[PDB]
Design a protein that fits this description.
The chain has about 130 residues and is mainly alpha-helical. The chain is about 30% helix and about 5% strand. It has a single domain (about 1-129), classed as Orthogonal Bundle (Lysozyme). It is globular and about 45 Å long. One of its GO terms (cellular component) is extracellular space.
């Protein structure tokens, strides 16, 4: 599924991301935009052999099992394919554990490089929330 901006914002808000660990909704929408272009089916393979999955590009080295990242960890206790669903519940629940890990939203390279320190509220403006 390719989400619309406001559609995703509303979905993330329902799942408890707005102000989760102090990150306003616009931060999460901005991160999803630049990580996946709002596409739940996005995958990208990394140089270390791990793969990033889903609308928030969650990495198989630490967070999910894809059966092909040896010596990796599965901290969200989910198959990585669950992160590609049109239902974002699994991605959101895993993202909450990532952002609680100590490094906040800096775990997402695109957030750090393209959202952090910008007017992220622009990503939810005009939405019925």
């Amino acid at each position: 599924k390719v989400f619309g901006r406001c559609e995703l914002a509303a979905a993330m808000k329902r799942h408890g991301l707005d102000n989760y660990r102090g990150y306003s909704l616009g931060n999460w929408v901005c991160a999803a935009k630049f990580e996946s272009n709002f596409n739940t089916q996005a995958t990208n393979r990394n140089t270390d052999g791990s793969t990033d999955y889903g609308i928030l590009q969650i990495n198989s080295r630490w967070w999910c099992n894809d059966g092909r990242t040896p010596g990796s960890r599965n901290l969200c206790n989910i198959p990585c394919s669950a992160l590609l669903s049109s239902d974002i519940t699994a991605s959101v629940n895993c993202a909450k554990k990532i952002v609680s890990d100590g490094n906040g939203m800096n775990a997402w390279v695109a957030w750090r490089n393209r959202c952090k320190g910008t007017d992220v509220q622009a990503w939810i403006r005009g939405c019925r929330l």
